[PDB]
């Protein structure tokens, strides 16, 4: 498989490092020579170039590449134009970092396959933690369902899962518990909740909200 990353900022450079650490080859490109130099021994092919020169991406051989990541940030126009060119070159999968909603909307119509929002998505998790302290983190599983990490409080602590009856009363499922350094997976109803346990829970976002209100 052939991988390329265009734009070596914190996202693009981290993609380059992660791919390198996974043990695969990656072409890493940036218009800034100093950035390219930083990745000269990390990427298998580090390239100084402007990705908005059509012949440049073609001459580099990006036609039919398996996956190209566009991580140009503040230059929304360069990002969009680069994406356009990659699509015309038949790149199978194009992932692009979006700067805003406008950027995303355009990227979607010109055929980016995956549009990602690293800063925004982490900000949302952090803000949710901030405003509800017992909720440590969450991961959306579908439009309706999420996984949520919940710190047990005094009300939960000391009771068996059987007695808590959370599935029947709240519609949500405790699928694991982090207890100290250990993770208890698929705990039985006989499991007793300890103070400072982190409950790993799956349910609808609606049911989770009701649980937070009732219990947290």
CA dihedral (141, 146, 151, 157) positive or negative: negative
Q: How many residues lie near ligand ATP (CB under 6 A)?
A: 22
Contact 86, 69 (CB under 8 A): no
Report the DSSP beta bridge partners of residue 5.
Answer: 28, 69
* CA–CA separation, 138 and 65 (whole Å): 34
Judged by beta carbon, residue 119 or residue 158, the one nearer a second copy is 119
Q: Which of 4, 5, 8, 164 binds ligand ATP (CB under 6 A)?
A: 8
Find the length of the chain.
216
Write the CB contacts of 34 (distance below 8 Å, at least 6 apart in sequence). none
CB 101 within 8 A of CB 127: no
Among 3, 4, 5, 12, binds ligand ATP (CB under 6 A): 12
Q: Does 9 bind a second copy (CB under 8 A)?
A: yes
Among 26-34, 70-78, 157-165, 172-180, which window interacts with Ca ion (CB under 5 A)? 70-78
- Is 56 one of the binding residues for ligand ATP (CB under 6 A)? no
Q: Which residues contact 102 (CB under 8 A, 6 or more apart)?
A: 76
**How many other β-carbons are positioned within 10 Å of the β-carbon of residue 162?**
12
State which residue has the least CB distance to ligand ATP: 73
151 membership: H or E segment, kind and range? strand 145-151
Using CB under 8 A as the binding rule, whether residue 162 contacts a second copy is answered as no
Binding-site residues sit at: 10, 30-32, 50-51, 72-74, 97-99, 103, 119
Note the residues at the interface with a second copy (CB under 8 A).
Answer: 1, 3, 9-11, 14-15, 17-19, 21-24, 67, 69, 95, 99, 116, 118-124, 126-128, 130-131, 137, 139, 141-145, 147, 173, 175-176, 178, 181-183, 185-186, 200, 202-203
Note the residues at the interface with ligand ATP (CB under 6 A).
Answer: 6-12, 29-32, 35, 50-52, 71-75, 78, 119
């Amino acid at each position: 498989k052939e991988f390329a990353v265009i734009g070596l900022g914190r996202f693009g450079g981290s993609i380059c490092k992660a791919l390198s650490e996974e043990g695969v080859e990656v072409m890493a490109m940036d218009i800034d020579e100093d950035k390219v130099n930083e990745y000269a021994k990390i990427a298998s092919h580090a390239v100084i170039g402007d990705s908005t020169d059509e012949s440049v991406l073609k001459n580099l051989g990006l036609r039919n590449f398996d996956h190209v990541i566009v991580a140009i940030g503040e230059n929304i126009q360069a990002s969009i134009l680069t994406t356009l060119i990659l699509k015309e070159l038949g790149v199978h999968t194009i992932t692009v970092k979006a700067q805003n909603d406008y950027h995303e909307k355009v990227l979607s119509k010109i055929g980016a396959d995956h549009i990602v929002h690293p800063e925004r998505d982490m900000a949302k998790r952090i803000a949710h933690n901030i405003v509800s302290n017992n909720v440590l983190d969450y991961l959306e599983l579908s439009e309706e369902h999420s996984l949520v990490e919940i710190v047990a409080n005094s009300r939960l602590a000391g009771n068996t899962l059987l007695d808590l009856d959370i599935r029947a009363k709240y519609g949500i499922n405790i699928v694991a518990i982090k207890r100290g350094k250990e993770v208890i997976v698929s705990p039985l109803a006989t499991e007793v909740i300890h103070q400072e346990d982190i409950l790993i829970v799956i349910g609808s976002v609606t049911d989770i909200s009701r649980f937070e209100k009732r219990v947290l």
